[PDB]
């Protein structure tokens, strides 16, 4: 499923799309 709210996203290197966008090394 979608990455919840508050995963630390690693800039634009992972084939997983977060629910929302990446925000100060996180996801919304």
Same mark, same amino acid.
């Given at each position: 499923?979608?990455? @919840? @709210? *508050?995963?630390?996203?690693? *800039?634009?290197?992972?084939?997983? @799309? #977060? #629910? *929302?966008?990446?925000?100060?090394?996180?996801?919304?």
């Amino acid at each position: 499923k979608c990455l @919840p @709210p *508050g995963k630390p996203c690693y *800039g634009a290197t992972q084939k997983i @799309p #977060c #629910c *929302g966008v990446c925000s100060h090394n996180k996801c919304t």
